[PDB]
Amino acid sequence: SVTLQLDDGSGRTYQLREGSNIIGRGQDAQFRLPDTGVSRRHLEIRWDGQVALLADLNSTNGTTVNNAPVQEWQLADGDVIRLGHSEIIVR
């Protein structure tokens, strides 16, 4: 089990569901961020009960994990995801 924590003092979190979890600003994102720099469909995290695999969906501004730019990236507990001016912690 894997939870993403939005680090904006809002305290919003989202637990990954098996399969595709879209993260973005758009209306059919599983976890939606009202950050103008975040793409409508910004990244996808595939989850199979063991491995959370992050993928940048060709976003306008990119995605970094732990301050390094990524395309595809297997997440770990404690990783910090940056998109737009937002930050998601993996816990």
Asked if residues 20 and 54 have their Cβ atoms less than 8 Å apart, the reply is: no
Q: Convert residues 40-79 into a mask of x (bound to other proteins by CB under 8 A) and - (unbound).
A: x------------------xxx------------------
Q: How far is the CB of 91 from other proteins (least distance, A)?
A: 26
Residue type, 58: N
Task: Give residues 10-29 in contact with other proteins (rule: CB under 8 A).
Answer: 25-27
65, 87 in Cβ contact below 8 A? no
Q: Among positive and negative, which fits the CA dihedral 11, 58, 76, 47? A: positive
Kindly list the residues in this chain that would bind other proteins in the complex (CB under 8 A). 25-27, 32, 34, 36-40, 59-61, 84
